[PDB]
Swiss-Prot record:
Family: Belongs to the dihydrofolate reductase family.
Pathway participation: Cofactor biosynthesis; tetrahydrofolate biosynthesis; 5,6,7,8-tetrahydrofolate from 7,8-dihydrofolate: step 1/1
SUPFAM superfamilies membership: Dihydrofolate reductase-like
Reaction(s) this enzyme catalyzes, per UniProt: (6S)-5,6,7,8-tetrahydrofolate + NADP(+) = 7,8-dihydrofolate + NADPH + H(+)
Every DHFR domain range: 1-158
A GO CC term assigned to this protein in UniProt: cytosol
Protein name, as recorded: Dihydrofolate reductase
Annotated substrate binding sites: 5, 27, 52, 57, 113
Effect of residue 85 to A: Decreases catalytic rate by one third. Increases catalytic rate about 7-fold
Gene field: folA
Keyword NADP: yes
Domain of life: Bacteria
InterPro entries reported for this sequence: DHFR, DHFR-like_dom_sf, DHFR_CS, DHFR_dom
Alphabetic keyword roster: Antibiotic resistance, Methotrexate resistance, NADP, One-carbon metabolism, Oxidoreductase, Trimethoprim resistance
Amino acid sequence: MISLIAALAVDRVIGMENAMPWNLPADLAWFKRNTLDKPVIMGRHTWESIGRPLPGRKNIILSSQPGTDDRVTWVKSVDEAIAACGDVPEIMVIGGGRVYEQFLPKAQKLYLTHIDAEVEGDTHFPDYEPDDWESVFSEFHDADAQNSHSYCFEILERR
Ligand SMILES: Nc1nc(=O)c2c([nH]1)NCC(CNc1ccc(C(=O)N[C@@H](CCC(=O)O)C(=O)O)cc1)=N2
Ligand SMILES: [Cl-]
Ligand SMILES: [Mn+2]
């Protein structure tokens, strides 16, 4: 099964780390926890922002063009990407925007962090029809000394 994971601001805006104005260790801990030991698929731009392979995870980069780093697995198509994951129970799609869009229709679960922040951005997470998804977990957190803004973690499953 394919699952998408992402941190959304108001308006479904998403953006790279440095582009994002919040500092949320709790959300990074959640991302870590839900992706560990699973293969992760990301776009080139995401790969470049991350800087190094995420440890304990098979890193697959979807890109039309040739790879430039032997530490990760380069694939050229969405099908190729799934094939490279092998026989695993859950594949995590970590963005960015275009990658999310390509995998949404194949996805069965979404792990979302809704951050209470207004920020400008080009990029938005794909529109998904709420009636087509069921919320199975939600949990609100206020901001604190460590965490810049308030957030709500949510897990949705395709009905
Ligand atoms: N687009 C979108 N934006 C959001 O802000 C959003 C969303 N989707 N998805 C999930 C979500 C979760 N937000 C929230 C907000 C408040 C509580 C909350 O008050 N929880 C209390 C229960 C209080 C009551 O029923 O009075 C709790 O402690 O569980 C939980 C989740 N927020
Ligand atoms: Cl990307
Ligand atoms: Mn070499």
